[PDB]
Amino acid sequence: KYSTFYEQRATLFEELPVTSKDIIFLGNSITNGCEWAELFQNKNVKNRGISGDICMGVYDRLDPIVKGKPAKIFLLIGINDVSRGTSADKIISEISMIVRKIKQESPKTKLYLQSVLPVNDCYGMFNGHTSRWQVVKQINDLLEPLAVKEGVAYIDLYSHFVEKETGKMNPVYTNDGLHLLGKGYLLWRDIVKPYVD
Amino acid sequence: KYSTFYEQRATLFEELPVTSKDIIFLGNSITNGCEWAELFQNKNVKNRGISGDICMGVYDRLDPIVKGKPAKIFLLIGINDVSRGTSADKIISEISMIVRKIKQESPKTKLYLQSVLPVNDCYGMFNGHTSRWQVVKQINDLLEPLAVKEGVAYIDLYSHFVEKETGKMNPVYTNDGLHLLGKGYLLWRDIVKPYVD
Ligand code: NA
Numbered sequence: 001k002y003s004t005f006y007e008q009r010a011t012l013f014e015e016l017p018v019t020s021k022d023i024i025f026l027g028n029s030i031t032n033g034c035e036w037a038e039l040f041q042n043k044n045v046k047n048r049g050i051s052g053d054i055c056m057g058v059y060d061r062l063d064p065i066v067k068g069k070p071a072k073i074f075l076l077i078g079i080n081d082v083s084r085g086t087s088a089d090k091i092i093s094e095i096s097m098i099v100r101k102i103k104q105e106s107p108k109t110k111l112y113l114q115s116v117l118p119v120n121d122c123y124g125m126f127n128g129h130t131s132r133w134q135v136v137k138q139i140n141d142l143l144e145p146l147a148v149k150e151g152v153a154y155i156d157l158y159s160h161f162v163e164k165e166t167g168k169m170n171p172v173y174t175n176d177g178l179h180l181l182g183k184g185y186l187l188w189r190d191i192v193k194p195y196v197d
Numbered sequence: 198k199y200s201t202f203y204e205q206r207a208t209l210f211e212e213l214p215v216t217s218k219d220i221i222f223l224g225n226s227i228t229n230g231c232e233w234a235e236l237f238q239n240k241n242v243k244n245r246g247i248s249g250d251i252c253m254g255v256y257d258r259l260d261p262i263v264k265g266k267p268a269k270i271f272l273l274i275g276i277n278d279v280s281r282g283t284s285a286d287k288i289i290s291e292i293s294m295i296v297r298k299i300k301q302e303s304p305k306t307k308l309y310l311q312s313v314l315p316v317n318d319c320y321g322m323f324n325g326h327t328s329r330w331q332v333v334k335q336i337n338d339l340l341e342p343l344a345v346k347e348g349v350a351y352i353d354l355y356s357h358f359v360e361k362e363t364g365k366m367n368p369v370y371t372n373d374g375l376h377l378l379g380k381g382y383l384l385w386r387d388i389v390k391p392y393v394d
Pocket residue numbers: 171172173174175
């Protein structure tokens with residue numbers, strides 16, 4: 001069901017042009033689930049999220065995005081690779097490939113690496129994801145130095161969504177332990193709005 | 198997974214305002230899967246689709262849409278009720294409730310009833326949907342008179358997507374027998390673009 005949905009969205013994305021004014025939100029279902037243009041009241045903000053996507057899935061569909069030379073790319077990816085048992089090291093290594101590809105194909109694009117969001121097992125759903133809540137911090141501990149090493153920005157969403165007493169996502173923003181309710185996207189908007197306009 | 202995703206999208210929709218200039222695309226995953234504003238290059242076009250949605254699910258979340266008094270509503274719903282074994286009669290009866298609610302809460306809104314799209318069992322997926330491909334025609338045969346009886350428009354997408362020799366969807370537009378590839382959304386755009394601008 002992922003590969004067919006991936007192909008549906010990816011072939012649609014190849015028909016929608018990307019211009020140099022565009023602000024791209026790129027990632028998996030946490031990106032897919034939002035109406036980003038409405039959330040920011042900005043016609044230039046475009047959704048390139050695909051539910052279920054992994055790091056190499058994003059890498060393989062970069063061409064219709066970088067060929068447009070967009071203004072900004074906000075990237076949030078990785079949690080689905082955690083659910084497959086992939087280590088934080090390999091995930092960082094695959095995110096590094098995405099960063100280098102973008103920097104070489106579109107050097108004027110501003111790239112923003114967003115921290116992987118925390119998860120919570122309290123609702124008993126997506127146990128492949130939520131049982132590995134400790135890996136989220138392992139990834140972000142490596143993701144921020146990668147951003148500095150490559151000269152791109154790092155956005156700490158994690159600290160605003162997490163409960164410091166548990167290390168898991170605050171249940172007020174989620175109904176399944178992984179995805180966001182409307183209130184979760186409003187918090188996300190408040191954090192990244194300065195980077196958008 | 199449907200009820201949690203339904204709540205995620207519905208609570209997001211309650212935070213996104215609807216204005217009198219807006220053109221709303223309302224329905225299930227076939228509506229959810231498109232970036233409608235990009236497809237028409239129109240900032241006023243907004244996505245209100247929810248994967249898995251049924252007729253009463255649409256009915257129950259009408260308030261944040263009709264309270265904005267939008268300019269146009271394009272509705273495509275029903276195929277998920279077919280997969281649950283519901284008869285065409287009851288589906289038409291529930292679509293009638295949606296039409297009356299919209300006409301009473303926002304009488305200036307132009308409502309466009311779109312034909313249910315054909316399905317195809319050739320890919321062996323979504324057998325609850327694709328095994329009942331004959332019900333699609335039963336619904337559209339009742340849906341067009343309902344549109345005339347209520348003074349709203351009926352848009353025949355079915356005739357452009359179907360193979361006349363089979364009564365099922367042309368496989369060139371789908372990779373699973375139910376959802377659309379990018380080429381399918383381009384055909385949809387060509388059919389309804391006159392009704393949008
Ligand atoms: Na909750």
